Design an enzyme around this catalytic site. Structure first.
Site, PDB file in Angstrom:
ATOM      1  N   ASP A   1       1.890 -11.192  10.852  1.00 52.17           N
ATOM      2  CA  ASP A   1       2.606  -9.997  11.318  1.00 52.17           C
ATOM      3  C   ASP A   1       1.662  -8.811  11.558  1.00 52.17           C
ATOM      4  OD1 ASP A   1       5.193  -8.638  12.023  1.00 52.17           O
ATOM      5  OD2 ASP A   1       4.890  -7.536  10.142  1.00 52.17           O
TER       6      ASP A   1
ATOM      7  N   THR B   1       9.547  -8.950  11.368  1.00 50.02           N
ATOM      8  CA  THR B   1       8.493  -9.718  12.027  1.00 50.02           C
ATOM      9  C   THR B   1       8.574  -9.603  13.584  1.00 50.02           C
ATOM     10  OG1 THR B   1       8.606 -11.184  10.086  1.00 50.02           O
ATOM     11  CG2 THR B   1       7.153 -11.890  11.882  1.00 50.02           C
TER      12      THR B   1
ATOM     13  N   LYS C   1       0.958  -5.594  13.463  1.00 53.56           N
ATOM     14  CA  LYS C   1       1.717  -4.560  14.177  1.00 53.56           C
ATOM     15  C   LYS C   1       1.174  -3.136  13.911  1.00 53.56           C
ATOM     16  CE  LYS C   1       5.491  -4.236  10.750  1.00 53.56           C
ATOM     17  NZ  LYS C   1       6.908  -3.820  10.585  1.00 53.56           N
TER      18      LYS C   1
ATOM     19  N   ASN D   1       1.533  -1.504  10.359  1.00 54.75           N
ATOM     20  CA  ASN D   1       0.645  -2.009   9.307  1.00 54.75           C
ATOM     21  C   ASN D   1      -0.793  -1.489   9.437  1.00 54.75           C
ATOM     22  OD1 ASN D   1       2.982  -3.530   8.566  1.00 54.75           O
ATOM     23  ND2 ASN D   1       2.144  -5.450   9.341  1.00 54.75           N
TER      24      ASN D   1
ATOM     25  N   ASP E   1      -0.179  -3.474   5.126  1.00 55.16           N
ATOM     26  CA  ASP E   1       0.928  -4.314   4.695  1.00 55.16           C
ATOM     27  C   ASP E   1       0.559  -5.788   4.833  1.00 55.16           C
ATOM     28  OD1 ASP E   1       3.660  -4.381   3.607  1.00 55.16           O
ATOM     29  OD2 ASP E   1       4.314  -5.045   5.600  1.00 55.16           O
TER      30      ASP E   1
HETATM   31  C1  B5G Z   1      11.398 -11.449   3.311  1.00 57.86           C
HETATM   32  N1  B5G Z   1      10.295 -11.105   2.397  1.00 57.86           N
HETATM   33  C2  B5G Z   1       9.019 -11.036   3.160  1.00 57.86           C
HETATM   34  C3  B5G Z   1       7.905 -10.190   2.521  1.00 57.86           C
HETATM   35  C4  B5G Z   1       8.508  -8.850   2.126  1.00 57.86           C
HETATM   36  N2  B5G Z   1       7.900  -7.675   2.191  1.00 57.86           N
HETATM   37  C5  B5G Z   1       8.564  -6.629   1.808  1.00 57.86           C
HETATM   38  N3  B5G Z   1       8.054  -5.328   1.860  1.00 57.86           N
HETATM   39  C6  B5G Z   1       8.473  -4.237   1.160  1.00 57.86           C
HETATM   40  O1  B5G Z   1       9.391  -4.290   0.360  1.00 57.86           O
HETATM   41  C7  B5G Z   1       7.792  -2.940   1.397  1.00 57.86           C
HETATM   42  C8  B5G Z   1       7.946  -1.856   0.509  1.00 57.86           C
HETATM   43  C9  B5G Z   1       7.305  -0.651   0.772  1.00 57.86           C
HETATM   44  C10 B5G Z   1       6.517  -0.511   1.916  1.00 57.86           C
HETATM   45  C11 B5G Z   1       6.352  -1.572   2.812  1.00 57.86           C
HETATM   46  C12 B5G Z   1       5.499  -1.467   4.069  1.00 57.86           C
HETATM   47  C13 B5G Z   1       6.378  -1.393   5.335  1.00 57.86           C
HETATM   48  C14 B5G Z   1       6.486   0.132   5.588  1.00 57.86           C
HETATM   49  C15 B5G Z   1       5.118   0.665   5.087  1.00 57.86           C
HETATM   50  N4  B5G Z   1       4.574  -0.311   4.114  1.00 57.86           N
HETATM   51  C16 B5G Z   1       3.389  -0.184   3.446  1.00 57.86           C
HETATM   52  O2  B5G Z   1       3.030  -1.071   2.684  1.00 57.86           O
HETATM   53  N5  B5G Z   1       2.640   0.944   3.631  1.00 57.86           N
HETATM   54  C17 B5G Z   1       1.402   1.303   3.043  1.00 57.86           C
HETATM   55  C18 B5G Z   1       0.580   0.394   2.355  1.00 57.86           C
HETATM   56  C19 B5G Z   1      -0.639   0.794   1.818  1.00 57.86           C
HETATM   57  C20 B5G Z   1      -1.067   2.109   1.951  1.00 57.86           C
HETATM   58  C21 B5G Z   1      -0.267   3.030   2.646  1.00 57.86           C
HETATM   59  C22 B5G Z   1      -0.724   4.379   2.803  1.00 57.86           C
HETATM   60  N6  B5G Z   1      -1.097   5.445   2.934  1.00 57.86           N
HETATM   61  C23 B5G Z   1       0.963   2.623   3.195  1.00 57.86           C
HETATM   62  C24 B5G Z   1       6.991  -2.777   2.544  1.00 57.86           C
HETATM   63  S1  B5G Z   1      10.149  -7.094   1.351  1.00 57.86           S
HETATM   64  C25 B5G Z   1       9.771  -8.773   1.684  1.00 57.86           C
HETATM   65  C26 B5G Z   1      10.691  -9.964   1.527  1.00 57.86           C
END
Ligand code: B5G
Ligand code: B5G
Lengths: 394, 365
Positions: free
Chosen positions: B194, B226, B196, B199, B212
């Protein structure tokens, strides 16, 4: 504070006396795998995902950390209620030890799953020549193992059976028990089980206590509260014999009773309150004022009779009720051979003649019976949980 | 073999940060056990009661000593995901500024998605690459999983494309950074699945680094594992070539303004990807069609005529001046992040809801 937090946090992980020690934390992961790896439990999505992630590494750890397979069993030297002591040699180092194994099943069934903790602390951290040293403590799904100092001189019940013990010898071994018990009382413990079976002799022929599984930590007043009677039917004290719910309050004086019983058997040949039925012994102890009688033919002194009767009385009139020096002062211990301050440095009455590092002449032969094992569980029971934190290496 | 050598190897596993049976991971076991066993129905068991009476007191002492959410002060909610959110935090003692990701343990247990974070943890903590957002600390409680990471003040590339009319010169730079970033992830034996602009995040200098990694997976055997950015081979084992598809989608959106397979209905996008054969420079068009290549090696991508420029070189790309450099007034500047709003049952028998999270705790240095 941040800096002060990680100073105390790291202190809790290297400390051998710590409950959350490095080797004790592995015991948790190990017990968890043992108690969860079953088909009925594996049906749980959470339990299955844990085992699929940790079973691989926990097996590698099982091979790395100390196991019973690393030791070569030479001969079964002793046998107890929940296990047996074996003369072992470590396969890698070739070092000779005495290993005591305790049945986890017999411990769970009989609800006696806490006695080993005090014995583990006493033997490992005593730092006294009067206590048999514990080098390593480990475990598996079936047993608890205690790799200890081997006593080639054997037990004292083997000594009085193989020798017609004179007063000169009796004077020595009694004084050693007195000094040994005082060392245990100094750590703030009541032995509650002083018997010749627990008294063992080293390569020089000097006494040192071994079974600390009946020990209890004394309070600030030097007393203890117990709703259950503990010890040996013949060596047990009258205040600790009747110890029930409500009336079970006693100090270290009960350990002096057992010294008198020991000195009597050392000189007379039999226990003072012996009966052909176990209940007969019970009645004789409570009636010690009329039950204690010495044989008509005597090899024994007036001061030895005084010292026995000083110990074989009611707690409130018993010798040693006002310090250990009270006992040391007795006329029976007045001699020309040794001194109290340098007793363990003098020559022992019997010195074991040892031909090899695995000599077992002082230990009488024993049979090497089938045991039971825990049934498969239909749900979480956690039979390995009361044993988490037993592993010790230091 | 031998006694003395077995103690060395056992001591290595205890200290090793990559180890499953690490010092900080072993405490997680004792911690989860106390969380899952301390209930009246379970405490009826003589074994469970004797364990808790012996360890609950000392485990609570550890809970206070070890890293807590209370150690950090939340400044602003910078991001939000499916199972949690990203907050701009300042550690109360050190006064250091970090980006903290929270993950709901209840949401993971309910939806059965309790394994995605493991790759996100290992990639961020053991990358040692400027192309990956660093993970400094990883901790947990009975409610959440916490990831104390490197804060990106430059913001996401979605905000960049929305606030700037991106020319080809800029598009050439950011695409090349993604290529170098993905190559670093493939080197570790991981496939993103993924890629994008959401991320892709920018640091204080304006340089790209991936963040991410919840969609990642460790490479099986040799190198196999995705929407709209999804590759057709994924739809239906596939290799690292699927991540290169998403680069082409990214380069298209950066120059055109819209995603190549966009549809007003999510179902329409799915059909357009499978029918890619029928659904402002020539060298830019040649690259987008090439990804829609890189199966043999990454050099094949680098040697394309689109990447030939007078500005930068492939070996010293992250050392050159970025097209946009973030103007930061303070250590807690959140101008590049768009504003957002600030805002289980008692078991009758052992369930072990904290078990799929045992071994998540990580402390760097
Ligand atoms: C079906 N399954 C597939 C895998 C999966 N995955 C999930 N994910 C989450 O629950 C999630 C939570 C908070 C944040 C994020 C993501 C998306 C939006 C931004 N982000 C960052 O990680 N941002 C960032 C990461 C590191 C540094 C900084 C900064 N500055 C920002 C994702 S549920 C899930 C269930
Ligand atoms: C009632 N509940 C409270 C206290 C208690 N306690 C137990 N105990 C045991 O199960 C046990 C097993 C093997 C051996 C021994 C004792 C008795 C026989 C010799 N021995 C040595 O420990 N011997 C030795 C000890 C140290 C070194 C050497 C040598 N050489 C020998 C005891 S169940 C139990 C249950």
């Amino acid at each position: 504070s941040f800096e002060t937090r990680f100073e105390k946090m790291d202190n809790l992980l290297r400390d051998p006396k710590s409950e959350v020690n490095s080797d004790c934390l592995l015991d948790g992961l190990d017990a968890l795998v043992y108690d969860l790896d079953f088909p009925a439990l594996r049906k749980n999505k959470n339990i299955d995902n844990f085992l699929s992630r940790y079973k691989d590494t926990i097996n590698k750890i099982r091979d790395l950390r100390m196991k019973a397979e690393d030791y070569e069993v030479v001969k079964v030297i002793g046998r107890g209620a929940f296990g047996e002591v074996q003369l072992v040699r470590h396969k890698s180092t070739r070092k000779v030890y005495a290993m005591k194994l305790l049945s986890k099943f017999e411990m769970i069934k009989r609800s006696d799953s806490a006695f080993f903790w005090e014995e583990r602390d006493i033997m490992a951290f005593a730092n006294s020549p009067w206590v048999v040293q514990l080098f390593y403590a480990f475990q598996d799904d079936r047993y608890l193992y205690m790799v200890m100092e081997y006593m080639p001189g054997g037990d004292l019940v083997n000594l009085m059976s193989n020798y017609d013990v004179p007063e000169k010898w009796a004077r020595f071994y009694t004084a050693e028990v007195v000094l040994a018990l005082d060392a245990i009382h100094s750590m703030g413990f009541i032995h509650r089980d002083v018997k010749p079976d627990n008294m063992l002799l080293d390569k020089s022929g000097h006494l040192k206590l071994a079974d600390f599984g009946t020990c209890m930590k004394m309070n600030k007043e030097g007393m203890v509260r117990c709703d259950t009677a503990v010890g040996t039917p013949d060596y047990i004290s009258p205040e600790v014999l009747k110890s029930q719910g409500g009336d079970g309050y006693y100090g270290r004086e009960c350990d002096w009773w057992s010294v008198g019983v020991f000195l009597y058997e050392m000189l007379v040949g039999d226990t003072p309150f012996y009966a052909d039925s176990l209940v007969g012994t019970y009645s004789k102890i409570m009636n010690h004022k009329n039950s204690l009688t010495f044989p008509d033919d005597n090899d024994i002194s007036k001061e030895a009779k005084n010292l026995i009767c000083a110990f074989l009385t009611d707690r409130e009139v018993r010798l040693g009720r006002n310090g250990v020096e009270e006992i040391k002062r007795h006329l029976f211990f007045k001699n020309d051979q040794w001194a109290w301050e340098t007793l363990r440095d003098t020559v022992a009455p019997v010195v074991p003649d040892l031909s090899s590092d695995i000599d077992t002449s002082n230990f009488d032969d024993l049979e090497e019976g089938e045991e039971e094992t825990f049934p498969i569980p239909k749900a979480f029971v956690g039979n390995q949980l009361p044993f988490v934190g037993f592993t010790y290496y230091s």
